[PDB]
């Protein structure tokens, strides 16, 4: 998190707001419910408290504008700048204006008025932009998800640096964004994508280019709004330029930024039984056209080329790769070496000598 210079703080807990005008794309009530939801976010974790006025002059003055709309800073038509806010202060201070060239909705369409407000209200309460991609106060918009909204920990920490906490936060457990260097870090799925390493953990993935040491951290819905937050497993078909992604019984094929025709499919179509309710980890071998799919203590070998499970499967992980425990969280392969992630550990399995070369902390893929 970041606060503003001089630590611009409201000195009163009971504040006021006023919705000057409204977006055509929404109903007055749908709009009032949003902003009210948006302050609730901040109020739930601070001594703060918000009261809507219906006339005159409030602390936070909320209006909708187009292009040049009053203040020296103009809006930019559709997309681009979504809104802006001023830090706590006397007049323009606390205000937030929203772009009216936008399709405001309370859904996954247009731009979510409640999401954009929650963010922009933060500025109004003294929070500057955060560098954490996990934070609400991150400079770039991303539709969080359909699921019920939780305020990220970075934000809770930042706002409480100013005011908080309050008496009863209705759900104390706020999502921390993963730590690349925590030696207890365990991974969800791993894949190559266009030469780079993709490492999934929660609602994020790291992308780590062979030539970099610090990976970048994306939110998964930043790339693929449609995919879930947590991923079970992932693998690539490189030559065919494509990445497969698993969660529960659904699985997606993706070419760069878009889902393929008629995905997701059920894993049953892959030949798996019905009692198998998730793929834990998966790796494709371009050499041979086959894909390993791990589930529980078992492993399937599917023929990615000819679309059929190999015969003699499933087999037990403990037979075909002994000594890596009986589960596989994530796996990828590189140049004859398979990397098997079991909790905070990673095993380097040599196909060549058919055994474990070395053993190392899972996060050492993240240059830790």
């Amino acid at each position: 998190y970041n606060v503003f210079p001089r630590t611009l703080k409201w000195s009163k807990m009971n504040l006021t707001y006023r919705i000057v005008n409204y977006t055509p794309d929404m109903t007055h009530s749908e709009v009032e419910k949003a902003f009210k939801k948006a302050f609730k976010v901040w109020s739930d974790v601070t001594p703060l408290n918000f009261t809507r006025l219906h006339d005159g002059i409030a602390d936070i003055m909320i209006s909708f504008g187009i292009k040049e709309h009053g203040d020296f800073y103009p809006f930019d038509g559709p997309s681009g700048l979504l809104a802006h806010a001023f830090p706590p202060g006397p007049n323009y201070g606390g205000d937030a204006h929203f772009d009216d060239d936008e399709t405001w909705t309370s859904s996954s369409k247009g731009y979510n008025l409640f999401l954009v407000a929650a963010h922009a209200f933060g500025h109004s309460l003294g929070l500057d932009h955060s560098k954490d991609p996990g934070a609400l106060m991150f400079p770039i918009y991303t539709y969080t998800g359909k699921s019920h909204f939780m305020l990220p920990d970075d934000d809770v920490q930042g706002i409480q640096s100013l005011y908080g906490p309050g008496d009863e936060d209705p759900n104390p457990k706020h999502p921390k964004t993963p730590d690349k260097c925590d030696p207890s870090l365990s991974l969800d799925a791993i894949t190559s994508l266009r030469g780079e390493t993709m490492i999934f953990k929660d609602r994020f993935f790291w992308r780590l280019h062979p030539q970099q040491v610090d990976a970048e951290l994306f939110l998964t819905k930043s790339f693929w709004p449609e995919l879930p937050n947590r991923i079970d497993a992932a693998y690539e078909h490189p030559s065919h330029d494509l990445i497969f992604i698993f969660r529960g019984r659904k699985f997606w094929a993706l070419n760069g930024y878009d889902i393929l025709e008629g995905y997701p499919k059920k894993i049953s179509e892959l030949g798996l039984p019905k009692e198998v309710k998730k793929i834990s980890a998966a790796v494709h071998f371009e050499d041979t056209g086959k894909t390993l799919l791990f589930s529980g203590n078992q492993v399937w070998r599917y023929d990615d080329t000819n679309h059929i499970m190999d015969k003699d499967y499933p087999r037990l992980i403990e037979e075909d790769f002994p000594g890596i425990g009986d589960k596989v969280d994530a796996v990828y392969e590189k140049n004859g070496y398979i990397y098997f992630f079991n909790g905070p550990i990673q095993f380097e399995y040599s196909i060549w000598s058919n055994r474990i070369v070395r053993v190392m902390p899972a996060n050492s893929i993240l240059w830790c």
Binding site: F4, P5, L8, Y73, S79, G80, L81, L82, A83, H84, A85, F86, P87, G89, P90, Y92, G93, Y111, V116, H119, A120, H123, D128, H129, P139, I140, Y141, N255, G256, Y257, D258
Partner: peptide
């Protein structure tokens, strides 16, 4: 004197931003 609001305005206004980037790229 002198008479002027030393904190007349704030440059510290900040905007949220969504890129105009586009789907269907192959």
């Amino acid at each position: 004197g002198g008479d002027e609001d030393d904190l007349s305005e704030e440059d510290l206004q900040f905007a949220e931003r969504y890129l105009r980037s586009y789907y269907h790229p192959t």
